[model samples]
Target: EVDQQILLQQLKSDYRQILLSYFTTDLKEKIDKFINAVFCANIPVPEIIEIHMELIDEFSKQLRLGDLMDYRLTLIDILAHLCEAYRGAIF
Candidate 1:
């Protein structure tokens, strides 16, 4: 499982990188969607990434669909996504 282990680490590390990309790509809100949608989905590893990416793409289309609260909350949401993504890896 050496390769699996490496790829999993890479997957999560890439997610952290994706989170930072929003600040530069202007996809900040989508990051929130990614977090919420992914966390709520409650799926696992390989399957989770695709679902989250699809939601992120949807979110990038410039449609709010509803209301939002605050930026700090969004950051928390992003944190939650990262936390959920690496739930097992961290401890």
Candidate 2:
């Protein structure tokens, strides 16, 4: 159940930095706070799925680095466990 929270803790701060321009102004604030809260070990509720899923996709896309299929697959497995923690929250 805590898989996503744990995986997220292990990810470097810069990994999800792409959301700077990606999150909307209204949601931007929420996302920023969410990051901080998550880092502080807060438990996120179900409503954050919408924001978190978009973040998952955006964060995954930023991992591209010179045909590194191994690295790409690594992220897939990493997120797989995390996203799975959400179960029905994901499509």
Candidate 3:
């Protein structure tokens, strides 16, 4: 069985790193790893969006900067990868 709380915490950690390193290629492997976990767990897209928005809200609270909103682009990039992930997993 999957641990929801543990997964949430892991997402928080990874998402924060993702935004912090938004311009780098270093997180490609991390994103791939996250996609595999999501694939096996069958986590829904809405929950993933919720996680993304919730993290954005948290970061907005922590730092008052327009740049944080820019990280939404990262979410889009992640979703694109996730789409491919599902496609690959199905094949």
Candidate 4:
């Protein structure tokens, strides 16, 4: 019950930043904006996780890296904010 196409595109753009410039100071800003998009769209938490995991596997193969576990931090960060956003909305 969401705009999967647009969300996927944003996720890709965000992931590109995470892979290319994760140390950027505005990380939270981008994460917040991305989460806001999902939040506003009323996307369920599980759906977001599924798309995230799918991209993780897809991108890993594209990069062909021996390890890309570090990117999980971005997922964790996103989830934490998403949870907070949902919580705030409920209250």
Candidate 5:
């Protein structure tokens, strides 16, 4: 469980950096901090999934459609990699 938490934390940090670099044009640092806080907490996957959905919805509403798609795709790729890295140990 400790290992799982560490892996998840690292993945979360990676995703936060990606978002900071790609989409967070104005508030990159603040957005990264927010993501870090949520993922670092002892939150369950369902809650994280809900938050992710909300983030996607909010970004889709705020950004250009094409950009939103790109960001979502990139995030999915990041998540896929993270899952693959920690495959059987995730749950």
Candidate 6:
């Protein structure tokens, strides 16, 4: 029973790491969708602010620098895509 508990704890830690990694990737995509929804679609400023705040909160909670660099890069890519997609749409 003791051995089983130790193994369970180890598995829980490992699973947490995996879940965090997944969130990092998922966050990037969500950020992109958020940007698109607000900027490309000309959503209200308050709505945009709300979405950005949520993203900032999520990143603060879920992301780490070393293991999630690709996720950060994905954010940059999404920004670029948004820029290209919405040229001259905003002042």
Best by lDDT: 3
TM-score of each: 0.31, 0.27, 0.80, 0.70, 0.37, 0.32
Q: Please give, for residues 10-79, the per-residue lDDT of candidate 1 as tens digits.
A: 4445454555464465665556555555455554545544534544555555455512222234445566
User: Model 5 compared with the native: what TM-score?
Assistant: 0.37
Residue-level error in angstroms, candidate 5, position 58: 2.3
The better-scoring model by TM-score among 1 and 3 is 3
| Better candidate by TM-score, 3 or 5 | 3
Runs in model 2 lying further than 4 Å from the true structure = 1-10, 13-66, 88-91
What is the C-alpha local distance difference test score of candidate 1? 0.51
Q: What is candidate 2's CA lDDT for residue 84? A: 48
Instruction: In candidate 4, list every pair of residues with a backbone clash.
Output: none
User: Residue 57 CA error for candidate 5 (Å)?
Assistant: 2.4
Worst 10 residues of 6 by lDDT: 10-19
Clashing pairs in 6: none
lDDT of each: 0.51, 0.43, 0.78, 0.71, 0.53, 0.46
In candidate 4, clashing pairs total 0
Candidate 4 per-residue lDDT over residues 1-91, each given as its tens digit: 4767776677666656654556555465767777888788787777776766677677778877533678777678778888898888786
Q: RMSD of candidate 1 to the true fold?
A: 12.5
lDDT for 52 in candidate 2 is 43
How would you order the candidates by TM-score, starting with the best?
A: 3, 4, 5, 6, 1, 2
Error of 3 at 1 (Å): 9.6
**Clash numbers, per candidate:** 0, 0, 0, 0, 0, 0
Instruction: Pick out the ten consecutive residues of candidate 4 with the lowest summed lDDT.
Output: 17-26
The true-versus-predicted C-alpha distance at residue 47 of model 6, in Å, is 9.1
lDDT of 6 by residue, 1-91 (tens): 6564454344334333333454454354544444554464454445433433445455566645122344444445545666665775655
The positional error of residue 46 in candidate 4, measured at the CA in angstroms, is 2.1
Residues 1-91, candidate 5, lDDT per residue (tens digit)?
5566675555455444555466545654544444455445645556555445556665567765423445676456445644554564577
Q: What CA RMSD would candidate 4 show?
A: 3.3
